Amino acid sequence: PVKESSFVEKMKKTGRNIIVFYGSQTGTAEEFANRLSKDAHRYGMRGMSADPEEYDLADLSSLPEIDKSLVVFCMATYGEGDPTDNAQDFYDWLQETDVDLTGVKFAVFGLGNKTYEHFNAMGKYVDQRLEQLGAQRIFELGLGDDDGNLEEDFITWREQFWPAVCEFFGVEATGEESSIRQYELVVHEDMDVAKVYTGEMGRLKSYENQKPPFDAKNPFLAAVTANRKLNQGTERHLMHLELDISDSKIRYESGDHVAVYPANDSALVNQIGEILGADLDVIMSLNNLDEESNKKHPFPCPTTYRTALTYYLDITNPPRTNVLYELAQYASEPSEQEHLHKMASSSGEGKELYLSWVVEARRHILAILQDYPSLRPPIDHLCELLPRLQARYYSIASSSKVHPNSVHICAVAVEYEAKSGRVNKGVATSWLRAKEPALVPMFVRKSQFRLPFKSTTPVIMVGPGTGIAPFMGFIQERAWLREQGKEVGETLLYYGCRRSDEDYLYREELARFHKDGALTQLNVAFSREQAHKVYVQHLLKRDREHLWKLIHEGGAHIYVCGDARNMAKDVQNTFYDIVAEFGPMEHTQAVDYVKKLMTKGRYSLDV
Numbered sequence: 001p002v003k004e005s006s007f008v009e010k011m012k013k014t015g016r017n018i019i020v021f022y023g024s025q026t027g028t029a030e031e032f033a034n035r036l037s038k039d040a041h042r043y044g045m046r047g048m049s050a051d052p053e054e055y056d057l058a059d060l061s062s063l064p065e066i067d068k069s070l071v072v073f074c075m076a077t078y079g080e081g082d083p084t085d086n087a088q089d090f091y092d093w094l095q096e097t098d099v100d101l102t103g104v105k106f107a108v109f110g111l112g113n114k115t116y117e118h119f120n121a122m123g124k125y126v127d128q129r130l131e132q133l134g135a136q137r138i139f140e141l142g143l144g145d146d147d148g149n150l151e152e153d154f155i156t157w158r159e160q161f162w163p164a165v166c167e168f169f170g171v172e173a174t175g176e177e178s179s180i181r182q183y184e185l186v187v188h189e190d191m192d193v194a195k196v197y198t199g200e201m202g203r204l205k206s207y208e209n210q211k212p213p214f215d216a217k218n219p220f221l222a223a224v225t226a227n228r229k230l231n232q233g234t235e236r237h238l239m240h241l242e243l244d245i246s247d248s249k250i251r252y253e254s255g256d257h258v259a260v261y262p263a264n265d266s267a268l269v270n271q272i273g274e275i276l277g278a279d280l281d282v283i284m285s286l287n288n289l290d291e292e293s294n295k296k297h298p299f300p301c302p303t304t305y306r307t308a309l310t311y312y313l314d315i316t317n318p319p320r321t322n323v324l325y326e327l328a329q330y331a332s333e334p335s336e337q338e339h340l341h342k343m344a345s346s347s348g349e350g351k352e353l354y355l356s357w358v359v360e361a362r363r364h365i366l367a368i369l370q371d372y373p374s375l376r377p378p379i380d381h382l383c384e385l386l387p388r389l390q391a392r393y394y395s396i397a398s399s400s401k402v403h404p405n406s407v408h409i410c411a412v413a414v415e416y417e418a419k420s421g422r423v424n425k426g427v428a429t430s431w432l433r434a435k436e437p438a439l440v441p442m443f444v445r446k447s448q449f450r451l452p453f454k455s456t457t458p459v460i461m462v463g464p465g466t467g468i469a470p471f472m473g474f475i476q477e478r479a480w481l482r483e484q485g486k487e488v489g490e491t492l493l494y495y496g497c498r499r500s501d502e503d504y505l506y507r508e509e510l511a512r513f514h515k516d517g518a519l520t521q522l523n524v525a526f527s528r529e530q531a532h533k534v535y536v537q538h539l540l541k542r543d544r545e546h547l548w549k550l551i552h553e554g555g556a557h558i559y560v561c562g563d564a565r566n567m568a569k570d571v572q573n574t575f576y577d578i579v580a581e582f583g584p585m586e587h588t589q590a591v592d593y594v595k596k597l598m599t600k601g602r603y604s605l606d607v
């Protein structure tokens, strides 16, 4: 592991009074942290972002040694209300700890989604725990909602945050504005092709000469063994991929996740270089104008613009308000420069404009640059404002017991008409779809979704659509525990699709698993073969009687995977309704009964 030296001392030697910590998994908490950090400057202060995993939060008790010190926590909730992987140490510390944080000023902005069981469990916990330890709070806990518009929640929070900080402290709004760069463009008018980054994530040339172990910092270029179309119809594109993980010493069980690092669309990369009048084949690097940080570049350098745009940056998701504000200065046409600046707006017509014209219309960077022709920003700066391309996760669709050498992926390619007028393409899926048996930089993330330990326990699997991914592994494995002489309890699947002749995923394989008894019951819900919708819940409601026999008397485990928005919630109320009917109890006590099955490892979600 190896922690970094005391962050308070580091702040002392750099004149920083505020540190902002990020509990990120996909770069959102990290992004917010960075914005708040650089914000401090225009308020008579100097901030600093930081990954908790790299430090000993115990040093928190030292922040008081710095004048007008402040710690902010931008945390995201994940798993069953669990903290993000980098926040684990911290979360764990917060508990065992006895430390006295007297004199510590803090504030917490949490990132969650009401769509889940444990809304901002992590954020709410950090804010609550630090106060117990003795630290004082200088601002109300923030509850951003990804389900609605997380970006806006953060803005209204940030808008109220700083003034309170300013008030509590002597500081105040200093000067007009800023427009300060984090990096310096050092053009390498000529450099050694062997010292140039071509798209690897960690060590230089790590993609070329592979060498275990492999992880998020060191992905394993797995070869694409197969890429099969699963959908019968033409409405959408659902595909099956098999990645060759031989000689990678990678370990995985059914239920785990596989992460992939994709490549943006080149037409979209080139057009950005083209409208910007820039040459993407310029070799360069952007070194931190702060020679005191670890983050020397905002991505592997030296590299070419083309490379950063292709493998290191996000050019398809809607630009955040701060990025747009920073760009406004490049709009020659004043009316256009207005719209841009006014989208960072505190609220009002501007907050209406950004939400509909950019987010709803789902305008990526290039689209903006096209609708505001007077906006031509220098390319080296745009690269500094663009967020990093994140790896995409997929629920490994195979069993290690059976395919220890391969990691399968069941996915639906994203492609749609945006409202922006253009057709959007899903980064990872469009990329995977183009792979023809072909390497995919990947890596596995251990999950909590797991078959039960004793092969005899009954399992109920509810996975509509692609939510069947992990279950293909589960079944593959149980089919194994039977072919292997072991005794297996009932294995039930509640799958759903549109029509059996359109997107019945794994129709054939699933039939074999039924004609062999690996699948006790194969209960499929064809949502569009009749005027009314027939969903999994309905099948569940139908078998209410038997399901209570496996749940209440059989000690069966419940697994739900798929859509979190509705399916998960719907499928849940049904289980409440079931329990509330059999071995009768009030509603309220049926929900507590159910919520108590998820606690005891018998009701697992993965949405």
Ligand SMILES: Cc1cc2nc3c(=O)[nH]c(=O)nc-3n(C[C@H](O)[C@H](O)[C@H](O)COP(=O)(O)OP(=O)(O)OC[C@H]3O[C@@H](n4cnc5c(N)ncnc54)[C@H](O)[C@@H]3O)c2cc1C
Pocket: 257, 316, 362, 392, 393, 394, 395, 396, 410, 411, 412, 413, 414, 415, 416, 417, 418, 425, 426, 427, 428, 429, 430, 466, 467, 469, 470
């Ligand atoms: C733990 C985990 C497991 C997953 N398992 C699977 C799996 O087994 N199978 C599978 O197919 N996917 C799975 N996903 C989804 C997967 O990670 C990708 O999101 C999906 O493949 C698309 O990625 P993309 O990069 O191609 O799309 P992106 O370019 O990243 O775009 C996706 C975003 O576009 C937006 N969007 C999508 N459609 C529309 C529309 N019509 N209108 C407006 N906005 C839209 C949404 O904000 C969405 O978040 C999983 C995700 C997680 C976190």
Ligand SMILES: NC(=O)c1ccc[n+]([C@@H]2O[C@H](COP(=O)([O-])OP(=O)(O)OC[C@H]3O[C@@H](n4cnc5c(N)ncnc54)[C@H](OP(=O)(O)O)[C@@H]3O)[C@@H](O)[C@H]2O)c1
Pocket: 395, 412, 464, 465, 466, 467, 468, 469, 496, 497, 498, 525, 526, 527, 528, 533, 535, 536, 537, 561, 562, 563, 564, 566, 567, 568, 570, 571, 606, 607
């Ligand atoms: N977190 C994870 O581990 C994980 C794993 C796999 C997938 N996912 C996610 O789940 C989503 C699945 O997309 P998909 O295209 O593959 O599924 P889908 O095709 O959109 O839907 C699958 C089936 O479910 C039905 N359905 C729709 N609303 C429902 C509800 N409220 N209750 C019960 N059934 C409902 C559909 O019927 P109708 O279309 O007719 O309405 C259809 O028959 C993706 O956004 C993906 O990100 C997450």
Ligand SMILES: Cc1cc2nc3c(=O)[nH]c(=O)nc-3n(C[C@H](O)[C@H](O)[C@H](O)COP(=O)(O)O)c2cc1C
Pocket: 023, 024, 025, 026, 027, 028, 029, 030, 076, 077, 078, 079, 080, 081, 082, 084, 111, 112, 113, 114, 116, 117, 118, 119, 120, 121, 146, 150, 607
């Ligand atoms: C698999 C998954 C699980 C999630 N679990 C939770 C959760 O338990 N609670 C919550 O409030 N939000 C949950 N969210 C919402 C995210 O925490 C929200 O999108 C957050 O902004 C992501 O932050 P990051 O980019 O910093 O990792 C989940 C999102 C995903 C994709």
